[PDB]
Design an enzyme around this catalytic site. Structure first.
Site, mmCIF file in Angstrom:
data_model
loop_
_atom_site.group_PDB
_atom_site.id
_atom_site.type_symbol
_atom_site.label_atom_id
_atom_site.label_comp_id
_atom_site.label_asym_id
_atom_site.label_seq_id
_atom_site.Cartn_x
_atom_site.Cartn_y
_atom_site.Cartn_z
ATOM 1 N N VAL A 18 0.863 -1.187 0.000
ATOM 2 C CA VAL A 18 0.000 0.000 0.000
ATOM 3 C C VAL A 18 0.899 1.236 0.000
ATOM 4 O O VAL A 18 1.812 1.359 0.836
ATOM 5 C CB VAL A 18 -0.964 0.046 1.205
ATOM 6 C CG1 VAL A 18 -1.897 1.249 1.094
ATOM 7 C CG2 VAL A 18 -1.769 -1.243 1.350
ATOM 8 N N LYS A 33 -3.240 0.501 -3.755
ATOM 9 C CA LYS A 33 -3.025 -0.861 -3.321
ATOM 10 C C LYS A 33 -2.710 -1.769 -4.489
ATOM 11 O O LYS A 33 -3.500 -1.849 -5.444
ATOM 12 C CB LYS A 33 -4.246 -1.391 -2.539
ATOM 13 C CG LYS A 33 -4.645 -0.506 -1.365
ATOM 14 C CD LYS A 33 -5.423 -1.253 -0.279
ATOM 15 C CE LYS A 33 -5.635 -0.343 0.908
ATOM 16 N NZ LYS A 33 -6.157 -1.150 2.064
ATOM 17 N N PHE A 73 -7.657 8.506 0.698
ATOM 18 C CA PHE A 73 -6.626 8.440 1.704
ATOM 19 C C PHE A 73 -7.144 8.938 3.027
ATOM 20 O O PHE A 73 -7.776 10.004 3.077
ATOM 21 C CB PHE A 73 -5.420 9.308 1.248
ATOM 22 C CG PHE A 73 -4.303 9.338 2.255
ATOM 23 C CD1 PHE A 73 -3.401 8.284 2.343
ATOM 24 C CD2 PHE A 73 -4.207 10.368 3.187
ATOM 25 C CE1 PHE A 73 -2.406 8.267 3.334
ATOM 26 C CE2 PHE A 73 -3.196 10.358 4.153
ATOM 27 C CZ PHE A 73 -2.281 9.318 4.201
ATOM 28 N N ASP A 77 -5.369 4.356 11.162
ATOM 29 C CA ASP A 77 -6.260 3.212 11.381
ATOM 30 C C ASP A 77 -6.587 3.088 12.869
ATOM 31 O O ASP A 77 -5.932 3.697 13.729
ATOM 32 C CB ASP A 77 -5.713 1.900 10.765
ATOM 33 C CG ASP A 77 -4.494 1.272 11.405
ATOM 34 O OD1 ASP A 77 -4.467 1.168 12.619
ATOM 35 O OD2 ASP A 77 -3.650 0.733 10.666
ATOM 36 N N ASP A 118 -13.708 -9.752 6.647
ATOM 37 C CA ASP A 118 -12.423 -9.702 7.344
ATOM 38 C C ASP A 118 -12.243 -8.384 8.051
ATOM 39 O O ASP A 118 -11.165 -7.754 7.968
ATOM 40 C CB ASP A 118 -11.242 -10.011 6.409
ATOM 41 C CG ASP A 118 -9.921 -10.281 7.115
ATOM 42 O OD1 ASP A 118 -9.944 -10.663 8.307
ATOM 43 O OD2 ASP A 118 -8.850 -10.058 6.487
ATOM 44 N N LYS A 120 -11.327 -5.868 10.912
ATOM 45 C CA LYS A 120 -10.297 -5.854 11.941
ATOM 46 C C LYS A 120 -9.911 -4.404 12.179
ATOM 47 O O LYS A 120 -10.116 -3.574 11.262
ATOM 48 C CB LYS A 120 -9.075 -6.710 11.513
ATOM 49 C CG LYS A 120 -8.310 -6.170 10.293
ATOM 50 C CD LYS A 120 -7.273 -7.157 9.743
ATOM 51 C CE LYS A 120 -7.899 -8.194 8.861
ATOM 52 N NZ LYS A 120 -6.865 -8.993 8.136
ATOM 53 N N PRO A 121 -9.316 -4.054 13.329
ATOM 54 C CA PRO A 121 -8.966 -2.644 13.545
ATOM 55 C C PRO A 121 -8.098 -2.039 12.460
ATOM 56 O O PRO A 121 -8.274 -0.843 12.161
ATOM 57 C CB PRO A 121 -8.295 -2.665 14.912
ATOM 58 C CG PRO A 121 -8.945 -3.832 15.637
ATOM 59 C CD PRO A 121 -9.089 -4.852 14.552
#
EC number: 2.7.11.22
Length: 287
Positions: A18, A33, A73, A77, A118, A120-121
Site C-alpha cells: 500500500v 493498493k 486516503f 487506522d 475480514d 479488523k482494527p
C-alpha cells in the site's frame, strides 16, 4: 500508473503493498493498493458501493498482470489509534460514535448483499473530524481470505465468527456483526477479546467466554463440518466480567452482536436502533 507519483510506502496489506500517492491529473492524494475476470467484475461493482462510512474506491486499474486499487486516503487506522490511546483508553462517547458509524456502513453494504468478511482494527480508518470508515469492503469475496498475506504474515483470526471456524462456507452478513462486536469489546477494555493463535485456540477462547455452544443455543451446531463432540464443555461467563466498565445498554448490545446462532445475531440495522445509541454524539478525536 504513470499518472500516479509514489509519496511513501504506508503499509503491507493482505494482498499487496500500500502506497500513499499523488494523482497527477486531479492533484488528489490517494492510497494505492497493489493486488481473473470474475475478480474484475466484482471489484468494478464496488466502485458504486458508496457511503460516507465506506472508504471510497476511486478506481480499479488492471495493467500488465498487475491490479491496482485507488482509494481515498485517510491518515490513521483504529489499531494505531487504540495503541496510542492505551494508557487512557478511547473515551466512551468516541467509542459509541465509532460503533454507530461502523454499524451505518455495515447496514448500507449489507442492504446491497455485500459482506466484508475480514473486519479488523487495521481495516477501520479514521480522520481528524471524528469519522470512521470501513476499508477493503468486498475484497475477501473477490480474492479470498488467505492463511498468510503476500509477505507471509499471519492473517489474524481474532475477529473471525464461530460459524466460519466451524466450517460454514455459506455464511451471512452476521459474520461482520461478530467481528464488529469483538472490536467494540477491544475498544472498551483495551485488550483483544479473543486473541487466538490457531483456529482451535480461537474457537476455544470463544467457548471459554461464551460457553461451548450446543443445540439449545445454536440449533444445528453439532452437525457443522468442523464441530467435534469431543470439544470441552465450558460454562458461559457474565458480560459484567468480560467488558467492565461498559454500561448495561452496551453489554446488552454486545451480547446480541456475539450470539452464536447467526440467525439470532443482531443485524446492523437493528443495532442502530438499540438504546445504547440514545445519547450518541460525534466527538473530535484527540490526534
Amino acid at each position: 500508473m504513470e499518472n500516479f507519483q509514489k509519496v511513501e510506502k504506508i503499509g503491507e496489506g493482505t494482498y499487496g503493498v500500500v502506497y500513499k500517492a499523488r494523482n497527477k491529473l486531479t492533484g488528489e492524494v490517494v492510497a494505492l493498493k497493489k493486488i481473473p475476470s470474475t475478480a474484475i467484475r466484482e471489484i468494478s461493482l464496488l466502485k458504486e458501493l458508496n457511503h460516507p462510512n465506506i472508504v471510497k474506491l476511486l478506481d480499479v486499474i488492471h495493467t500488465e498482470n498487475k491490479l491496482y486499487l485507488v482509494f481515498e486516503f485517510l491518515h490513521q487506522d483504529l489499531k494505531k489509534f487504540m495503541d496510542a490511546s492505551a494508557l487512557t483508553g478511547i473515551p466512551l462517547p468516541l467509542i459509541k460514535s465509532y460503533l454507530f458509524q461502523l454499524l451505518q456502513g455495515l447496514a448500507f453494504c449489507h442492504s446491497h448483499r455485500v459482506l466484508h468478511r475480514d473486519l479488523k482494527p487495521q481495516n477501520l480508518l479514521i480522520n481528524t473530524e471524528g469519522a470512521i470508515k470501513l476499508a477493503d469492503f468486498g475484497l475477501a469475496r473477490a480474492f479470498g481470505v488467505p492463511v498468510r498475506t503476500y509477505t507471509h504474515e499471519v492473517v489474524t483470526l481474532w475477529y473471525r465468527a464461530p460459524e466460519i471456524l466451524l466450517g460454514c462456507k455459506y455464511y451471512s452478513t452476521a459474520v461482520d456483526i461478530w467481528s464488529l462486536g469483538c472490536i467494540f469489546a477491544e475498544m472498551v477494555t483495551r485488550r483483544a477479546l479473543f486473541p487466538g493463535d490457531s483456529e482451535i485456540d480461537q474457537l476455544f477462547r470463544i467457548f471459554r467466554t461464551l460457553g461451548t455452544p450446543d443445540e439449545v443455543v445454536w440449533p444445528g451446531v453439532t452437525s457443522m463440518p468442523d464441530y467435534k463432540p469431543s470439544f470441552p464443555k465450558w460454562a458461559r461467563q457474565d458480560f459484567s466480567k468480560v467488558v467492565p466498565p461498559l454500561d448495561e445498554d452496551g453489554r446488552s448490545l454486545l451480547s446480541q452482536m456475539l450470539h452464536y446462532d447467526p440467525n439470532k445475531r443482531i443485524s446492523a440495522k437493528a443495532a442502530l436502533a438499540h438504546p445504547f445509541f440514545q445519547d450518541v454524539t460525534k466527538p473530535v478525536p484527540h490526534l
